Design a protein around this ligand. Sequence first.
Ligand SMILES: COc1ccc(N2C[C@H](O)c3cc(S(N)(=O)=O)sc3S2(=O)=O)cc1
Ligand SMILES: [Hg+2]
Ligand SMILES: [Zn+2]
Length: 256
Amino acid sequence: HWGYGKHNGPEHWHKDFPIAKGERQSPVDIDTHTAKYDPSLKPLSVSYDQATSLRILNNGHAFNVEFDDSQDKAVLKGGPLDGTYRLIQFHFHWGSLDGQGSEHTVDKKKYAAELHLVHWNTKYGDFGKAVQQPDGLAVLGIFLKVGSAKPGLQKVVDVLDSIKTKGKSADFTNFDPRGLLPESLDYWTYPGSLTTPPLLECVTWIVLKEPISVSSEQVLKFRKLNFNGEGEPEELMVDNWRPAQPLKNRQIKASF
Ligand SMILES: COc1ccc(N2C[C@H](O)c3cc(S(N)(=O)=O)sc3S2(=O)=O)cc1
Ligand SMILES: [Hg+2]
Ligand SMILES: [Zn+2]
């Protein structure tokens, strides 16, 4: 079944998910010089102060930190969005080396990792219904750059030994997602898709202009995870990213 290996990675995805060849697939290259500065874009409103994390889980493709989305506890509004979008989980895509790992690239430059904060549009009642809609999800994408440690990332990094193999989870309450945001909330936005199977074109992508820094030992920890379940041969979880797709008649708008 799908993964990121030679035999089941991105280039093979189209056979089971034909939408991989669709019209608004993600990720894409953000060419800064032809993105259109749109003056009618409102600022983003990230209200993560009431966020309730529940659990961290290795799912064989990445580790996800899941949040309680039963009430409007951590939401995203504003920007290009019409409506309130609830936070349900965040995850990362990273490389085996520091020069690759992001999914979106800026002027073809790749970062060491990319954080995705997944939100679903509350007018659709639940996540399941939201993924049936063109404006069902908004994902906030943050590039991670190697340098100085991000203190808010360290709690995540310390629990990764308990969830080394596929299927393991550990309770992960009281984690505050605000410690992973950059200073600026300037962004690029375009209509796109999920970047893993099922590749549904349900997403308004909001990619922040400002990267956050993590140390190499923090990102090293990411690389010790396993794609495999325990008792299986070990495959290190590295390079779990999809290459950029053609923009195909889409324009990227810049809030700046
Ligand atoms: C059957 O219903 C479902 C439909 C979709 C999903 N997704 C899991 C995917 O792995 C995936 C990938 C995302 S990314 N890299 O941000 O573009 S977001 C996301 S998901 O959590 O929405 C789960 C259940
Ligand atoms: Hg959709
Ligand atoms: Zn992702």
